[PDB]
């Protein structure tokens, strides 16, 4: 896929921090009532966003993040944080500050930031 969820040349593993990213960070956000627009890649056709992929060059979604964790794709929890930040930043870049999707992203980001601040090690 694009972005990729597997790469045979890239070292990957599951540390305590990556276990925390999966079992605490991703799983908590997945249960949130505002998380569903982020489970899958943005569908620019269904949503009538013809310029979406002209503006957003590094797409990211929580389904991709979940698969990366399931595949031991990451070496560092910092990479998982990067993916979340790409997802949030993409939302803030593309959309108007008043769009409901932006408020939904802000709610998830606050939980992401709180859980990351409490990550051990
Ligand atoms: C990840 C993501 C990033 N960006 C955007 N951008 C966007 C996507 C959709 C409109 C939209 O439909 N706005 C309507 C247009 C007509 N008006 C009358 C009312 C507002 C818009 F404004 C922005 N979406 C994303 N995912 C997403 C996935 C599923 C759905 Cl159903 C939606 N639709 S949504 O945003 O409207 C809702 C979640 C609040 C129902 C969005």
From Swiss-Prot:
The organism of origin for this protein: Homo sapiens
Tissue expression from the record: Ubiquitous.
Domain Bromo stretches: 13-119
Transmembrane domains' residue ranges: none
Places the protein is found: Nucleus; Chromosome
Region (Acetylated histone H3 binding): 57-59
Domain comment as written in the entry: The Bromo domains specifically recognize and bind acetylated histones. The NET domain recognizes and binds the 'KIKL' motif found in chromatin proteins.
Disease: A chromosomal aberration involving BRD3 is found in a rare, aggressive, and lethal carcinoma arising in midline organs of young people. Translocation t(15;9)(q14;q34) with NUTM1 which produces a BRD3-NUTM1 fusion protein.
Oligomer status and interactors: Interacts (via bromo domain 1) with GATA1 acetylated at 'Lys-312' and 'Lys-315'. Interacts (via bromo domain 1) with GATA2 acetylated on lysine residues. Interacts (via NET domain) with CHD4 (via KIKL motif). Interacts (via NET domain) with SMARCA4 (via KIKL motif). Interacts (via NET domain) with NSD3 (via KIKL motif). (Microbial infection) Interacts with the Integrase protein of Moloney murine leukemia virus (MLV).
Function of the protein: Chromatin reader that recognizes and binds acetylated histones, thereby controlling gene expression and remodeling chromatin structures. Recruits transcription factors and coactivators to target gene sites, and activates RNA polymerase II machinery for transcriptional elongation. In vitro, binds acetylated lysine residues on the N-terminus of histone H2A, H2B, H3 and H4.
UniProt similarity note: Belongs to the BET family.
Name listed for the protein in its UniProt record: Bromodomain-containing protein 3
């Amino acid at each position: 896929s694009m972005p990729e969820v597997s790469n045979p040349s890239k070292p990957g593993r599951k540390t305590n921090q990556l276990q925390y990213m999966q079992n605490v960070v991703v799983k908590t956000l997945w249960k949130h009532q505002f998380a569903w627009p982020f489970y899958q890649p943005v569908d620019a056709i269904k949503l009538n966003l013809p310029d979406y992929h002209k503006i957003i060059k590094n797409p990211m979604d929580m389904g991709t993040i979940k698969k990366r964790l399931e595949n031991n794709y990451y070496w560092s929890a910092s990479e998982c944080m990067q993916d979340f930040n790409t997802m949030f930043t993409n939302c803030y870049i593309y959309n108007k500050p008043t769009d409901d999707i932006v408020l939904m992203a802000q709610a998830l980001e606050k939980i992401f930031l709180q859980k990351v601040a409490q990550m051990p090690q």
